[PDB]
Amino acid sequence: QFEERHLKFLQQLGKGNFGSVEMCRYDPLQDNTGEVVAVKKLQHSTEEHLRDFEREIEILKSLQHDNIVKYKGVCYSNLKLIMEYLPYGSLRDYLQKHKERIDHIKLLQYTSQICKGMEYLGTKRYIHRDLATRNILVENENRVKIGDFGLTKVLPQDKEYYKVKESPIFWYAPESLTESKFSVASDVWSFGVVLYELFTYIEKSKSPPAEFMRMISIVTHLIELLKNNGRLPRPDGCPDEIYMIMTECWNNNVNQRPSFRDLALRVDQIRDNMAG
Numbered sequence: 175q176f177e178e179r180h181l182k183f184l185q186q187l188g189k190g191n192f193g194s195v196e197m198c199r200y201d202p203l204q205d206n207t208g209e210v211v212a213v214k215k216l217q218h219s220t221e222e223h224l225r226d227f228e229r230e231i232e233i234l235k236s237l238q239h240d241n242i243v244k245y246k247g248v249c250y251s252n253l254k255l256i257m258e259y260l261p262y263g264s265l266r267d268y269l270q271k272h273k274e275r276i277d278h279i280k281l282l283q284y285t286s287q288i289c290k291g292m293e294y295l296g297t298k299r300y301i302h303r304d305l306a307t308r309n310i311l312v313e314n315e316n317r318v319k320i321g322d323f324g325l326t327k328v329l330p331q332d333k334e335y336y337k338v339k340e341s342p343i344f345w346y347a348p349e350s351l352t353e354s355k356f357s358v359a360s361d362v363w364s365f366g367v368v369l370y371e372l373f374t375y376i377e378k379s380k381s382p383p384a385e386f387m388r389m390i391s392i393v394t395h396l397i398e399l400l401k402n403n404g405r406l407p408r409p410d411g412c413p414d415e416i417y418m419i420m421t422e423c424w425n426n427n428v429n430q431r432p433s434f435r436d437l438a439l440r441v442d443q444i445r446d447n448m449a450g
């Protein structure tokens with residue numbers, strides 16, 4: 175496995191409320207030729223949280239896909255999830271830092287890959303629940319991965335939704351805000367928000383919090399706005415078939431939101447029509 179005594183702390187890669195992600199070297203020969211790894215652990219470790227976490231490792235372990243971050247293992251004395259380390263970091267940071275080299279055709283490459291990732295998730299009846307650029311990783315200039323599964327649930331065998339009561343409320347589907355119900359359709363809502371993020375280049379002045387707050391007890395006010403068909407605006411320069419996808423994803427009716435398989439096709443065609 176991984177002996178935690180050969181696991182060297184290099185640098186803090188992020189902190190997410192109830193969990194941390196660290197860059198570490200696993201170095202059993204103590205000459206720093208050991209492999210650099212990403213290491214996830216809990217921070218205010220709770221009995222319920224540990225169980226959630228042991229459920230999360232199983233999920234990721236079960237997942238094998240070019241656009242899902244690779245499981246490497248676990249380490250125990252203090253339960254730590256071990257994953258491959260991807261230097262380019264989260265898509266959110268990466269976009270802001272290299273956007274001058276990221277054009278619309280490139281954004282649409284990342285988008286398709288996210289959809290394929292999500293296609294594969296639904297193939298296992300997995301609801302991600304935390305779709306946002308902060309959770310997508312950048313492999314190389316031509317590839318992204320879904321890189322965290324902290325809120326991921328498995329749909330009961332009978333149901334098309336999973337119920338669970340801080341939350342990323344400016345990414346949440348209406349029914350998710352009022353009923354705590356999540357689904358592939360709620361994941362499709364959030365994907366639409368991810369698409370928005372992508373097409374605003376993560377500009378602080380254009381963020382879902384920024385825009386909704388300008389439109390706006392905060393969660394209540396927000397429920398009213400979405401009920402009333404208040405929606406994030408079309409990003410500057412955003413193609414009409416792209417804002418179209420976003421608005422379809424943001425359908426109030428759960429049964430009217432597109433499919434990931436359809437989203438992947440349409441995105442791929444938009445991007446191929448743009449190019450040549």
Ligand SMILES: C[C@@H]1CCN(C(=O)N2CCCC2)C[C@@H]1N(C)c1ncnc2[nH]ccc12
Binds near residue numbers: 190195212214259261
């Ligand atoms: C983007 C990704 C998910 C979120 N995470 C994080 O901060 N959180 C998830 C749990 C709470 C906080 C950061 C993590 N980053 C930057 C990584 N960077 C490089 N290689 C990596 N391998 C595995 C993750 C990872």
